[PDB]
Structure 1
Amino acid sequence: SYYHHHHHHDYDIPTFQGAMGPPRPSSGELWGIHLMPPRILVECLLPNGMIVTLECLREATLITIKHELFKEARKYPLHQLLQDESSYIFVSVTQEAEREEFFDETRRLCDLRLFQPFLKVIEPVGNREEKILNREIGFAIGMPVCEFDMVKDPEVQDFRRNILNVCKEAVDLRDLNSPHSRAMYVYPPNVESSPELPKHIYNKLDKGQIIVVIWVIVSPNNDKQKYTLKINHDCVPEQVIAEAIRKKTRSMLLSSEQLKLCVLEYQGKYILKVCGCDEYFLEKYPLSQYKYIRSCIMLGRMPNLMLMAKESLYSQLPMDCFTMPSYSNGETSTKSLWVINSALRIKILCATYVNVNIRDIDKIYVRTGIYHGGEPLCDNVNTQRVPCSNPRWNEWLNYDIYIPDLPRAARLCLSICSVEHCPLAWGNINLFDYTDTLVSGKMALNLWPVPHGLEDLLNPIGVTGSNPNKETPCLELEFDWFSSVVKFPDMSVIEEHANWSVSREAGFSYSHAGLSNRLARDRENDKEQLKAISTRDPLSEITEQEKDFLWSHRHYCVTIPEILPKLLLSVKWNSRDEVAQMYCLVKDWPPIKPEQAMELLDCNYPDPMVRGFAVRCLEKYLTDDKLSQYLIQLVQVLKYEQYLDNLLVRFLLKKALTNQRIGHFFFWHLKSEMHNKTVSQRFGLLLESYCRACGMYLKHLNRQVEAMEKLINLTDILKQEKKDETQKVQMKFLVEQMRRPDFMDALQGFLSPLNPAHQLGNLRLEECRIMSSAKRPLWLNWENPDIMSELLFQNNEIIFKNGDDLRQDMLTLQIIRIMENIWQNQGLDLRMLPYGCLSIGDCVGLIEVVRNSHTIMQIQCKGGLKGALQFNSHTLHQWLKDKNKGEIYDAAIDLFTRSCAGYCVATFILGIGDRHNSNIMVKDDGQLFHIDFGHFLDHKKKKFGYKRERVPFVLTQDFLIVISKGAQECTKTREFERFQEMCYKAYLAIRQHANLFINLFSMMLGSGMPELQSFDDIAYIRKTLALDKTEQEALEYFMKQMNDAHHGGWTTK
Structure 2
Amino acid sequence: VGNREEKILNREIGFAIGMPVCEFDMVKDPEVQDFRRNILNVCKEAVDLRDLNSPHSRAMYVYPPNVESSPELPKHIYNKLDKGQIIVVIWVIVSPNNDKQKYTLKINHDCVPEQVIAEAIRKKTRSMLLSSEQLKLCVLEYQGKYILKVCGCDEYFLEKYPLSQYKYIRSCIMLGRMPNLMLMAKESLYSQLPMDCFTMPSYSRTKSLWVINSALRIKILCATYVNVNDKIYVRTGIYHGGEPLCDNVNTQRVPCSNPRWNEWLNYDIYIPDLPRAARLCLSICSVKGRKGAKEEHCPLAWGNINLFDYTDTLVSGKMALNLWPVPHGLEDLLNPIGVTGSNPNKETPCLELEFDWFSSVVKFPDMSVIEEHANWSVSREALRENDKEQLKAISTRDPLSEITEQEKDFLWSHRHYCVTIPEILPKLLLSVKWNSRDEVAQMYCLVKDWPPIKPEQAMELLDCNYPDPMVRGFAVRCLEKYLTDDKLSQYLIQLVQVLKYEQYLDNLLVRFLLKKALTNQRIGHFFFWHLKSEMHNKTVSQRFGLLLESYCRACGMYLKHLNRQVEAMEKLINLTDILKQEKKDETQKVQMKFLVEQMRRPDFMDALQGFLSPLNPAHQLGNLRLEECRIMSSAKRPLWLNWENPDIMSELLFQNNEIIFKNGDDLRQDMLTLQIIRIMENIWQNQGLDLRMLPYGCLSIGDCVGLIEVVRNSHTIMQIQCKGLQFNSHTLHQWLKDKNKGEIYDAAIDLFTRSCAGYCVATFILGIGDRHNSNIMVKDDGQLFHIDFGHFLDFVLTQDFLIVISKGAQECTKTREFERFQEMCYKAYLAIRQHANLFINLFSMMLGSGMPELQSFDDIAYIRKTLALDKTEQEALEYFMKQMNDAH
TM-score normalised to structure 1 length: 0.82
Secondary structure of 1:216's counterpart equals: strand
The answer to whether the 8 A contact 2:6-2:201 is kept is no
The answer to whether the 8 A contact 2:235-2:251 is kept is no
| 1:871-928 Cα shifts (integer Å, max 9, x gaps) | 2212111111111112211011111101000101110111112211111100001100
Superposed displacement of residue 257, structure 1: 8.1
The answer to whether the 8 A contact 1:250-1:259 is kept is no
- Trace 1:230-245 onto structure 2 (pairs within 5 A): 230-245=106-121
The answer to whether the 8 A contact 2:698-2:707 is kept is yes
Q: Give me the whole-angstrom Cα distance separating, in 2, the residues matched to 1:809 and 1:610.
A: 31
Secondary structure of 2:885's counterpart equals: helix
Aligned length: 876
Q: Which moved more, 1:992-1001 or 1:317-326?
A: 317-326
Superposed displacement of residue 670, structure 1: 0.3
| 1:457-499 Cα shifts (integer Å, max 9, x gaps) | 3222222222333333222211001112111111122122222
Secondary structure of 2:219's counterpart equals: strand
Q: Which moved more, 1:715-724 or 1:367-376?
A: 367-376
Residue identity (%):
100
Q: Which moved more, 1:164-173 or 1:482-491?
A: 482-491
Superposed displacement of residue 352, structure 1: 2.2
Q: Give me the whole-angstrom Cα distance separating, in 1, the residues matched to 2:154 and 2:218.
A: 59
The answer to whether the 8 A contact 2:238-2:248 is kept is no
Relative distance call for 1:217 and 1:428 in structure 2 (3 A) is same
The residue number in structure 2 matching 1:408 is 276
Q: Give me the whole-angstrom Cα distance separating, in 1, the residues matched to 2:757 and 2:40.
A: 50
The answer to whether the 8 A contact 2:282-2:334 is kept is yes
| 1:220-239 Cα shifts (integer Å, max 9, x gaps) | 46332211111111110010
Q: Give me the whole-angstrom Cα distance separating, in 2, the residues matched to 1:780 and 1:425.
A: 42
| 1:310-367 Cα shifts (integer Å, max 9, x gaps) | 0110111110211211212xxxxx111111111111111112233444xxxx543222
| 1:219-277 Cα shifts (integer Å, max 9, x gaps) | 44633221111111111001001101111221352348834752232121001100111
Q: Which moved more, 1:898-907 or 1:423-432?
A: 423-432
Relative distance call for 1:403 and 1:763 in structure 2 (3 A) is same
Secondary structure of 1:465's counterpart equals: coil
Q: Give me the whole-angstrom Cα distance separating, in 1, the residues matched to 2:125 and 2:360.
A: 81
Superposed displacement of residue 130, structure 1: 5.0
Q: Which moved more, 1:884-893 or 1:721-730?
A: 721-730
Q: Give me the whole-angstrom Cα distance separating, in 2, the residues matched to 1:260 and 1:785.
A: 38
Secondary structure of 1:918's counterpart equals: coil
The answer to whether the 8 A contact 2:283-2:299 is kept is yes
Relative distance call for 1:251 and 1:376 in structure 2 (3 A) is closer
Q: Give me the whole-angstrom Cα distance separating, in 1, the residues matched to 2:8 and 2:792.
A: 46
| 1:651-700 Cα shifts (integer Å, max 9, x gaps) | 00000000000000000000000000110000000000000000000000
The answer to whether the 8 A contact 1:376-1:572 is kept is no
The answer to whether the 8 A contact 1:385-1:391 is kept is no
Superposed displacement of residue 400, structure 1: 2.0
| 1:821-847 Cα shifts (integer Å, max 9, x gaps) | 011112211011000000001110000
The answer to whether the 8 A contact 2:247-2:268 is kept is no
Q: For 2:504, which of 632, 643, 648 is the aligned residue? A: 643
Q: Give me the whole-angstrom Cα distance separating, in 1, the residues matched to 2:131 and 2:783.
A: 51
Superposed displacement of residue 129, structure 1: 5.3
Relative distance call for 1:205 and 1:569 in structure 2 (3 A) is same
The residue number in structure 2 matching 1:741 is 602
Superposed displacement of residue 404, structure 1: 1.0
Q: Give me the whole-angstrom Cα distance separating, in 1, the residues matched to 2:123 and 2:879.
A: 60
Secondary structure of 1:838's counterpart equals: strand
Superposed displacement of residue 421, structure 1: 4.3
The answer to whether the 8 A contact 1:443-1:478 is kept is yes
Q: For 2:444, which of 562, 580, 583 is the aligned residue? A: 583
Relative distance call for 1:698 and 1:673 in structure 2 (3 A) is same
Relative distance call for 1:479 and 1:210 in structure 2 (3 A) is same
Superposed displacement of residue 443, structure 1: 1.8
Relative distance call for 1:353 and 1:820 in structure 2 (3 A) is same
The answer to whether the 8 A contact 2:323-2:349 is kept is yes
The answer to whether the 8 A contact 2:221-2:352 is kept is yes
Q: Which moved more, 1:470-479 or 1:610-619?
A: 470-479
Relative distance call for 1:797 and 1:374 in structure 2 (3 A) is closer
The answer to whether the 8 A contact 1:376-1:573 is kept is no
1:469 aligns with 2:469: no
The answer to whether the 8 A contact 2:215-2:267 is kept is yes
Q: Give me the whole-angstrom Cα distance separating, in 2, the residues matched to 1:608 and 1:277.
A: 43
Superposed displacement of residue 800, structure 1: 0.7
The answer to whether the 8 A contact 1:453-1:1013 is kept is no
Q: Give me the whole-angstrom Cα distance separating, in 1, the residues matched to 2:212 and 2:549.
A: 40
| 1:37-96 Cα shifts (integer Å, max 9, x gaps) | xxxxxxxxxxxxxxxxxxxxxxxxxxxxxxxxxxxxxxxxxxxxxxxxxxxxxxxxxxxx
Q: Give me the whole-angstrom Cα distance separating, in 2, the residues matched to 1:160 and 1:692.
A: 11
Superposed displacement of residue 595, structure 1: 0.8
Structure 1: give runs of 5+ residues left out of the alignment. Answer: 1-124, 329-333, 506-522, 939-952, 1046-1053
The answer to whether the 8 A contact 1:385-1:392 is kept is no
The answer to whether the 8 A contact 1:210-1:233 is kept is yes
Q: For 1:428, which of 304, 318, 338 is the aligned residue? A: 304
| 1:165-217 Cα shifts (integer Å, max 9, x gaps) | 10000000001111111110000000000111111110001331100111112
Relative distance call for 1:965 and 1:225 in structure 2 (3 A) is same
- Trace 1:642-681 onto structure 2 (pairs within 5 A): 642-681=503-542
| 1:772-822 Cα shifts (integer Å, max 9, x gaps) | 113111111011010110100011110111111111101110110111101
Secondary structure of 2:642's counterpart equals: strand
The answer to whether the 8 A contact 1:365-1:381 is kept is no
The residue number in structure 2 matching 1:501 is 377
Secondary structure of 2:90's counterpart equals: strand
Q: Give me the whole-angstrom Cα distance separating, in 1, the residues matched to 2:579 and 2:333.
A: 43
Relative distance call for 1:739 and 1:452 in structure 2 (3 A) is closer
Q: Give me the whole-angstrom Cα distance separating, in 1, the residues matched to 2:527 and 2:67.
A: 19
CA RMSD of aligned residues (A): 1.6
The answer to whether the 8 A contact 2:535-2:702 is kept is yes
1:615 aligns with 2:476: yes
Secondary structure of 1:366's counterpart equals: strand
Relative distance call for 1:874 and 1:181 in structure 2 (3 A) is same
Q: Which moved more, 1:668-677 or 1:128-137?
A: 128-137
Q: Give me the whole-angstrom Cα distance separating, in 1, the residues matched to 2:526 and 2:61.
A: 14
Q: Give me the whole-angstrom Cα distance separating, in 1, the residues matched to 2:80 and 2:446.
A: 49
Structure 2: give runs of 5+ residues left out of the alignment. Answer: 288-295
Report which of the two structures shows the higher radius of gyration computed on alpha carbons: 1
Q: Give me the whole-angstrom Cα distance separating, in 2, the residues matched to 1:369 and 1:742.
A: 54
The answer to whether the 8 A contact 1:809-1:934 is kept is yes
| 1:631-664 Cα shifts (integer Å, max 9, x gaps) | 0000000000000000000000000000000000
Q: For 2:239, which of 365, 371, 388 is the aligned residue? A: 371
Secondary structure of 1:182's counterpart equals: helix
Superposed displacement of residue 451, structure 1: 2.9
Q: Give me the whole-angstrom Cα distance separating, in 2, the residues matched to 1:278 and 1:820.
A: 26
The residue number in structure 1 matching 2:99 is 223
Q: Give me the whole-angstrom Cα distance separating, in 1, the residues matched to 2:886 and 2:403.
A: 34
Relative distance call for 1:303 and 1:1039 in structure 2 (3 A) is same
Q: Which moved more, 1:689-698 or 1:253-262?
A: 253-262
| 1:581-606 Cα shifts (integer Å, max 9, x gaps) | 11111111000011110000000100
Structure possessing the higher relative contact order (Cα contacts under 8 Å, 6 or more residues apart):
2
TM-score normalised to structure 2 length: 0.97
Q: Give me the whole-angstrom Cα distance separating, in 1, the residues matched to 2:368 and 2:410.
A: 29
Q: Give me the whole-angstrom Cα distance separating, in 2, the residues matched to 1:1023 and 1:985.
A: 18
1:1022 aligns with 2:847: no
Secondary structure of 1:344's counterpart equals: strand
Q: Give me the whole-angstrom Cα distance separating, in 2, the residues matched to 1:553 and 1:810.
A: 41
| 1:540-589 Cα shifts (integer Å, max 9, x gaps) | 02111111111111000100000000111111111111111111111110
Relative distance call for 1:126 and 1:394 in structure 2 (3 A) is closer
The answer to whether the 8 A contact 2:152-2:649 is kept is yes
The answer to whether the 8 A contact 1:376-1:574 is kept is no
Secondary structure of 2:183's counterpart equals: strand
Q: Give me the whole-angstrom Cα distance separating, in 2, the residues matched to 1:344 and 1:436.
A: 17
The residue number in structure 2 matching 1:294 is 170
